[PDB]
Amino acid sequence: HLRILFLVRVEDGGEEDFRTAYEQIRWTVAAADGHIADQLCQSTVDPHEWLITSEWESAGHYTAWARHEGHRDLAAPIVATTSSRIHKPFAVR
Template sequence: MPVTEGAAQGRVLFLITVKEERREDFLAAYEQIRHLVAEGVPGHLRDQVCQSSADPEQWLITSEWRSLEDFAAWERTEEHRDLVRPMRACFSDARSVRFHIKAETSRDTPRAGLSTPTTAG
């Protein structure tokens, strides 16, 4: 769906390295917090945890938010630090980047300027 001008939806990407011996601990820690965040953190829309097909120690967590301000507000809380501490203990390297979503495309996204053809019958 197109994102309207002025919309501040955001996506946060966490690029992390998890050594093989910590993988199960990492996944268990993620499992412990994912529903708490999805159900209780204002502005959180969805997230995914992904493992690289080329390097099993490389992971990506994508997190989509109503606004990046919602994410930043939650990140500053003690609750956030307490919830993610067990997961972060599994990282051997991590970095995050934040993006404003400007447009989104899916099968159902209408093309601008195109009308639906009709058939005469």
């Protein structure tokens, strides 16, 4: 299994639009072959730091989803609502 950490920074007042951006992504991964779970989280220490994390049957299932059409209006709102974006892949042990 693959666990993705998508770590971002959201600027003041950006919660509403960032959450909407997450929900639109969530819509498309709920239907994705091999999607196991995903969550949107906010740091309890620095409220600017947020996490989108998901779990997949394999890295190949994630890549299939990422390589699907329509992500133009999925990535654009993420860029517009975040000031920093880090992607970290992990294998579940």
